Amino acid sequence: EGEVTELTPCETENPMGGYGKTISHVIIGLKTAKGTKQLKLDPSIFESLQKERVEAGDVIYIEANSGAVKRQGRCDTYATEFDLEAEEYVPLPKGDVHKKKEIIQDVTLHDLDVANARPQGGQDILSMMG
Amino acid sequence: QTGNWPWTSPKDGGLGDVRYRYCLTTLTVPQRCIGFARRRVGRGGRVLLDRAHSDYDSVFHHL
Amino acid sequence: QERRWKVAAAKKLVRTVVRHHEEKQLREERGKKEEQSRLRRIAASTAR
Amino acid sequence: TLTFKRPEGMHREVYALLYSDKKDAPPLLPSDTGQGYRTVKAKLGSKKVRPWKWMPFTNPARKDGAMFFHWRRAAEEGKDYPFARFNKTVQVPVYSEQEYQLYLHDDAWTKAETDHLFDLSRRFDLRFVVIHDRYDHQQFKKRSVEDLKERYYHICAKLANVRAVPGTDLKIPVFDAGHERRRKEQLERLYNRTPEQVAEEEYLLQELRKIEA
Amino acid sequence: ALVVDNGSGMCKAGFAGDDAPRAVFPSIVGSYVGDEAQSKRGILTLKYPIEHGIVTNWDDMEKIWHHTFYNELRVAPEEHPVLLTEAPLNPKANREKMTQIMFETFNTPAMYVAIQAVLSLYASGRTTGIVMDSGDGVTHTVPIYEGYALPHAILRLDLAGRDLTDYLMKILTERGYSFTTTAEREIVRDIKEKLCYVALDFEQEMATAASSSSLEKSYELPDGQVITIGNERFRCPEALFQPSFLGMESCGIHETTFNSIMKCDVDIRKDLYANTVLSGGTTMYPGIADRMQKEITALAPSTMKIKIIAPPERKYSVWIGGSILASLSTFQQMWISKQEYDESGPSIVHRKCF
Amino acid sequence: GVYGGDEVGALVFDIGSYTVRAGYAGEDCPKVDFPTAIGMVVPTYYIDTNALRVPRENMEAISPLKNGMVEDWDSFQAILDHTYKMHVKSEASLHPVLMSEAPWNTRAKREKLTELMFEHYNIPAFFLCKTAVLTAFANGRSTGLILDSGATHTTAIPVHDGYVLQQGIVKSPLAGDFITMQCRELFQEMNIELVPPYMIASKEAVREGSPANWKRKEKLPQVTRSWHNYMCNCVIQDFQASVLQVSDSTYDEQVAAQMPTVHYEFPNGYNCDFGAERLKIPEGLFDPSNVKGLSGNTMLGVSHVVTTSVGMCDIDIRPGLYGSVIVAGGNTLIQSFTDRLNRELSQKTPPSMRLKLIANNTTVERRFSSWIGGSILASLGTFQQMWISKQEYEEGGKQCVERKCP
Amino acid sequence: ETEIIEGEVVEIQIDRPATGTGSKVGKLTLKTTEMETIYDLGTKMIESLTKDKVQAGDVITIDKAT
Amino acid sequence: FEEWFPQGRPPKVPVREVCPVTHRPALYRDPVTDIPYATARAFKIIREAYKKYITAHGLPPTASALGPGPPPPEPLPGSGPR
């Protein structure tokens, strides 16, 4: 996580055949508080990337196993006597650019029963009928 | 134990006058722990931060 | 300490200056090679 | 708000006068324009500098009244020099020739020797190694030791203090010169030992260390 | 950000990030300045505030900088940072006076002072080298190691373009053509800049001139009169390598360069020989680089690899380096601020600038 | 309250036998550093490399100094005039001057110098300090032993609380000039004809150990033998700086012979690879008893000079001397000099005393320590009462320097 | 703790479609008894103003960061 | 290609704005004309100002105009940045 700064595609011209222009990587540079680092991601991230509508100066969230991008907002450096946005100029995060998070949550079996018994998905009409 | 000067000399050898002591320090601008450091006034009234080498500076960074 | 700061800052400045010089050469050669590649594409589009 | 760290969990610290090592990183200097000039253009543009001037000044605790020059703000012209407050002088006693007749010269010292000693004491702030180095041993014989000058300075000071005060008594200026002489003699005898004697002392101390525990 | 290179003869001023200066004009004052003073010399007597790279009259230098800001560039100096340049071995009080003038008289928000040779090294894209900077009034040789100028090894040579112009006037008068006045000085300077060159071998060139007309070239005066120039084409630049022609008991630029190299530590000399860069308008004569290569190869050990760096744009290398430096993001922390001056005095320039 | 330092527009001069260091106070390096040796024609003087290195007829080469003290006052005055005119480029009546002097300088020369600076140059203020004190001050030390190995002398000077202890000084003549003489003897032994650069018009490359191939300038004037010897010594000094290396331990010929050689090329194109002889030569600094033709075994090495100087001091301050050994001088810049000195002193210092050599091994710090200390001292605001003023000189005469500048 | 902005509108100016987020950028002027100021817009609230039929001289209030 | 990779080069930080009258960081925005302010008193002085300048000629409109926060720890220019 951190502030995106690059949105830089790589290039190798051709995919070993008839070609236009081929990228073969996407360079994504993050900086949050502790430093800055460049990540050469899979090219497949690009679809999800403009699906999340990210641009330079935004701050994002990407998970390692899935590679799923999520936009959190944009930094407070473009804020502080600007205001007036529902997205909130979410502050520039603390800590290292790369993080390993260990979440522990306590739960009872009855909670699991109650949660799994119901159709909690809001995309179905019967859920909001509930 | 043989004595030593007030400086270049911790309590393991001599007098540890704290004005010569470097200690781990952190800055409010997001640049992290800078490792061991003193505060010293220079010429012109300007307050500087000295810094000292450690073999674990790579650990104090991303600590 | 002022002497050490001066020499370190001077070293960093020259290193950044030569990097600035080199990046312009890389930019211009990549740009002209991309121009030639686009020529290669548009010329063959008519044949296609 | 701002944090510095002296942790128990790592437990280390370093000391140095100039710098710890040649691989030490350079210091961090203050700056206002680190984030660019356009970030702070209004803050600087809404202000005007106070004028400075290259200007004369007096009294660093000089007796001649000579005026040197320096940079200070123009509004601070007539101020007395701050560093004159450092001019502290050691309180060496003074005496007349009548008073010397009860600082009587022991039939070993002279008036000239005592005056020379006190002149050097005033000049060098009672740094008796320096006074010993600068003592005119040729004109006044090899007094030496530093204890025979320390003890005569201190007995003269004790007699002068006993004279001038209506009533008192004085503990620490009772200078035991023989103790100092024996101490320095013992230190010299340890200094001039050959390495075999030092090894013998180490062997005996190690034997005591092992046998007592 | 503004970059102002107030050299000995000509003041080059412009904006950072540009590839060349926007304004170039003489560093003279009458209240008229520059070309106005030079054209109207019959009204007011002319003066040089800079003598051999050192400022000697600050009241005139204030007028020059005022002309630079409000007439040439046409900008308010209170709205831009200003990068200034100083000759090597400048007195430390001149830095303080410059800082005082910038912050109090013109009210700049920020400023900096840099050494001209270091800027030439930046322009040539080198980390380590020696810079032969020959201007209009003074010549210097400045060895630089990892961007740090070594002050104990710097050597000054009191020989520059004005002396060469005077010597050209002398030898042309010896031929027969009279040139005495300041009006004729610009004509002779044009002849110097257009026709002179550095001979690779002076004696053989002199013999060739004596035995043939192949080296001769004609010149046309503003009056329409036409003259011919012979061995004076290469006799005048030769004074850089043979100052005895000028009546000077001094070493040449090649010997000065070699001596300045030899005043440095033994480890770095291989880098200095391989990165000898020429700078200034006086180094613009054709053939000077090859002659310097030959002369320094004659002096230096055979194991060293001599390379002379003479860019075509070497008469503005100092300004180009200043423009490069002032545009960097890493440099922006190195500006002296208005508040820093107000709290620390003119001595802040010694704290921040090197 | 108060402030930090204070800058007063002072100048700092440190004049040695090899070079003259000068500059403005508050700076961290001397502005200028040119040779002390000057030409004379008879008188007319030629100073600095650009004027000195040009050959000229009947021009002798001299020095103003002898044994670290001024002898030729006309030459000294010429050097100061040159420094004020061409290098400082400012009027002398405006700037206070702090001058370095030898630790062993006599009273009469101090008085003569004070009279010269005040009556001729009309400076407004003056101060005179010794080299060892400024060398200590440059490293932030008030107490310590200064080992200065320059051109003429290798000297151990103890310092305590900012004062030189003159009765603890130990001088030796084994220094850079002795090394230059030994290199001359080596080249004579090797049949290496030494041609200085001024005689050479052109040269051609040759093989290792082969005769040189060079052409002599025809237009030379006849030059004195002193100037020629000075020019030759300028070559031998480069040879010293390049080739010589101190043995890490006691010299053994079979061990030094197995070390890699060092290639050196002379100005006339002669070149050869140097083996154990480059380490045998500087060994005489440490063990002079084995030197060939040297006058007797009575003289001392560098380590023995240090130990003798410390042992001649009071027993109370010897820990403070061995705990700060400040190595200085250009001759200490020979490779592995400091390591050898540290090892030898560790083998001779008592185990009860901790030994600590100051980390100082750079050309600037080793050669210009005294100037840096002078700049530091003149930059102090506390120091500004310690100047001798012109009024003080006119009232008390030249004798006030003894009271004010100990 | 209520971090609100409130006032009476004076003037509104919003741009026409120009591709991207520029299609809805604009400005919005508020006035009170002793003050008035002009505020830029975040391109998403304009539909709420049109839905509520914003009128010159009408009184509104907003909550900061939402 | 480029409509899928436009790239970016935004200004990392803005200009930090300061009120001409009594300083401190700017609040609200600029008025309907001119330049930002911190307080209603600053707004009042700024609106009393700019009536001296709509003539496009006259005396200095802002040289210490109406006591615009005049204590000089470091002296102040006139409040005419527009």
Spatial CA neighbour of D25 closest among B33, E347, B45, F323: B33
DSSP string, C1-48: -HHHHHHHHHHHHHHHHHHHHHHHHHHHHHHHHHHHHHHHHHHHHHH-
CB contact under 8 A, D19 and C1: yes
Q: What angle do CA E222, E228, E231 make, to 5 degrees?
A: 130
Using CA atoms, how far apart are residues E315 and D183, in angstroms rounded to an integer?
A: 75
DSSP category for residue H12: S
- Contact status of A36 with chain H (Cβ, < 8 Å): no
DSSP category for residue D30: -
Q: Give chain C's length.
A: 48
**Residue F163 phi, psi (nearest 5):** -130, 140
Solving technique: cryo-EM
Decide: E30 and E43 in contact? Cβ < 8 Å. Answer: yes
CB contact under 8 A, A94 and B30: yes
How many alpha carbons lie under 13 Å from residue E266 in its C-beta half-sphere? 13
| Alpha helices by DSSP H, F165-312 | 176-189, 225-243, 253-257, 277-280, 302-311
**Residue D212 phi, psi (nearest 5):** -80, -10
Secondary structure (3-state) at A127: helix
Decide: E149 and E115 in contact? Cβ < 8 Å. Answer: yes
In chain E, residues with a C-beta closer than 8 Å to the C-beta of C2 are 351
- Distance (Å) from the alpha carbon of C23 to chain A's nearest alpha carbon: 16
In chain F, residues with a C-beta closer than 8 Å to the C-beta of C2 are 28
Backbone Cα Rg of chain A: 20
Q: Say what angle helices C2-47 and E116-123 make with each other, to 10 degrees.
A: 30
- Name the residue of chain E whose CA is nearest to F263's CA: E303
Of B2, B5, B41, the CB nearest to F4: B41
Q: What angle do CA E180, E182, E184 make, to 5 degrees?
A: 60
Long-range Cβ contacts of H62-67 (<8 Å, 24+ apart): H62/H20
- Contact status of D49 with chain H (Cβ, < 8 Å): yes
Decide: F153 and F333 in contact? Cβ < 8 Å. Answer: no
CB contact under 8 A, E337 and D31: yes
CB contact under 8 A, D44 and E109: yes
Tokens at residue E155, please? 């050597």
Q: Report the first-to-last Cα separation within chain D, whole angstroms.
A: 51
- Name the residue of chain E whose CA is nearest to B45's CA: E344
CA distances from E196 to E132, F84, H44 (A): 20, 37, 70
Q: Which residue has the tokens 């009947």?
A: F58
Using CA atoms, how far apart are residues E47 and E30, in angstroms rounded to an integer?
A: 6
CB contact under 8 A, B45 and E343: yes
DSSP string, A20-72: S-B---EEEEEESSS-EEEEEE-TTHHHHHHHTT--TTEEEEE-TTT--EEEE
- Contact status of E203 with chain F (Cβ, < 8 Å): no
- Distance (Å) from the alpha carbon of D33 to chain H's nearest alpha carbon: 12
Using CA atoms, how far apart are residues F95 and D155, in angstroms rounded to an integer?
A: 47
- Contact status of F381 with chain B (Cβ, < 8 Å): no
Of F163, F166, F382, the CB nearest to D86: F382
CB contact under 8 A, D16 and B22: yes
CB atoms under 10 Å from CB of D188, counted, come to 13
Q: Say what angle helices F302-311 and F337-348 make with each other, to 10 degrees.
A: 50
Strands E110-115 and E336-337: antiparallel
Which residues have a Cβ under 8 Å from the Cβ of E47 and sit 6 or more positions away? E28, E29, E30, E57, E60
Using CA atoms, how far apart are residues F165 and G6, in angstroms rounded to an integer?
A: 82
In chain A, residues with a C-beta closer than 8 Å to the C-beta of C41 are 20
In chain A, residues with a C-beta closer than 8 Å to the C-beta of C39 are none
Of H16, H23, H75, the CB nearest to D39: H16
Tokens at residue F115, please? 């009279």
- Distance (Å) from the alpha carbon of B42 to chain C's nearest alpha carbon: 9
Spatial CA neighbour of F371 closest among F176, F99, F87, F117: F99
CB contact under 8 A, H4 and A50: yes
Which residues have a Cβ under 8 Å from the Cβ of C9 and sit 6 or more positions away? D26, E334, E354
Decide: F47 and F82 in contact? Cβ < 8 Å. Answer: yes
Decide: F125 and D66 in contact? Cβ < 8 Å. Answer: yes
Chains H and F touch (3+ CB pairs under 8 A): no
CB contact under 8 A, C41 and A13: no
Using CA atoms, how far apart are residues E200 and H3, in angstroms rounded to an integer?
A: 59
Spatial CA neighbour of A4 closest among A87, A71, A100: A71
CA distances from F397 to B62, D120, F402 (A): 67, 21, 11
Strands F69-70 and E82-86: unpaired
Task: Go through D156-171 and write b for each residue having 16 or more CB atoms within 10 A of its CB, e for each that does not.
Answer: bbebbeeeeeeeeeee
Q: Which residue has the tokens 């340049």?
A: E85
Of D1, D6, D25, the CB nearest to B23: D6
Q: Which residue has the tokens 């002068």?
A: D160
CB contact under 8 A, D3 and B26: yes
Using CA atoms, how far apart are residues E115 and F300, in angstroms rounded to an integer?
A: 47
- Name the residue of chain G whose CA is nearest to A90's CA: G65
In chain B, residues with a C-beta closer than 8 Å to the C-beta of C1 are 40, 42, 48, 50
CB contact under 8 A, E148 and C7: yes
CA distances from F36 to E9, E316, F110 (A): 34, 37, 19
Of E118, E126, E147, the CB nearest to C11: E147
CATH number for position A8: 2.40.50.360
Specified resolution (Å): 2.4
Q: Report the first-to-last Cα separation within chain C, whole angstroms.
A: 69
Using CA atoms, how far apart are residues E145 and E143, in angstroms rounded to an integer?
A: 7
The neighbours of chain D, by the rule of 3 or more Cβ pairs under 8 Å, are B, C, E, F, H
The neighbours of chain H, by the rule of 3 or more Cβ pairs under 8 Å, are A, D, G
In chain E, residues with a C-beta closer than 8 Å to the C-beta of D48 are 107
- Name the residue of chain F whose CA is nearest to D119's CA: F403
Burial label for D8, CB within 10 Å (0-12, 13-18, 19+), is exposed
Using CA atoms, how far apart are residues F119 and E158, in angstroms rounded to an integer?
A: 31
CA distances from D212 to D202, D205, D209 (A): 15, 10, 6
Using CA atoms, how far apart are residues G4 and F397, in angstroms rounded to an integer?
A: 82
- Distance (Å) from the alpha carbon of D42 to chain F's nearest alpha carbon: 30
In chain H, residues with a C-beta closer than 8 Å to the C-beta of G38 are 29-32
Using CA atoms, how far apart are residues F193 and F210, in angstroms rounded to an integer?
A: 12
CB contact under 8 A, H40 and G35: yes
Q: In which domain, by residue range, is A76 found?
A: 1-115
In chain C, residues with a C-beta closer than 8 Å to the C-beta of F28 are 2-3, 6
The kind and range of the H/E element at D202 are: helix D195-212
Using CA atoms, how far apart are residues E19 and E316, in angstroms rounded to an integer?
A: 10
- Contact status of A20 with chain C (Cβ, < 8 Å): yes
Instruction: For residue F117, give the amino acid letter.
Output: M
Instruction: For residue E332, give the amino acid letter.
Output: Q
Chains B and F touch (3+ CB pairs under 8 A): yes
Burial label for H77, CB within 10 Å (0-12, 13-18, 19+), is middle
- Contact status of H59 with chain G (Cβ, < 8 Å): no
CA distances from E64 to E22, E38, E318 (A): 16, 13, 19
CB contact under 8 A, D24 and C4: yes
- Contact status of B4 with chain F (Cβ, < 8 Å): yes
Q: Which domains does chain E have, with CATH numbers?
A: 1-116+318-354 (3.30.420.40), 117-158+252-317 (3.30.420.40), 159-250 (3.90.640.10)
- Distance (Å) from the alpha carbon of E213 to chain F's nearest alpha carbon: 29
CB contact under 8 A, E335 and D52: no
Secondary structure (3-state) at F172: strand
Tokens at residue D37, please? 């000039």
Which residues have a Cβ under 8 Å from the Cβ of E221 and sit 6 or more positions away? E187, E227
Tokens at residue H7, please? 């790239």
- Contact status of A84 with chain G (Cβ, < 8 Å): yes
Residues 14-33 of C with CB under 8 A from D: none
Secondary structure (3-state) at F369: helix
Spatial CA neighbour of E196 closest among E225, E178, E222, E172: E172
Burial label for E138, CB within 10 Å (0-12, 13-18, 19+), is buried
Decide: B63 and B56 in contact? Cβ < 8 Å. Answer: no
Backbone Cα Rg of chain H: 18
Decide: B33 and B24 in contact? Cβ < 8 Å. Answer: yes
Q: Which residues of H touch D (CB under 8 A)?
A: 12-18, 20, 23, 72, 74-77, 81
CB contact under 8 A, A81 and H13: no
Of A32, A34, A92, the CB nearest to B62: A34
- Name the residue of chain D whose CA is nearest to E351's CA: D29
Strands E110-115 and E82-86: parallel
- Distance (Å) from the alpha carbon of D17 to chain B's nearest alpha carbon: 5
Chains D and F touch (3+ CB pairs under 8 A): yes
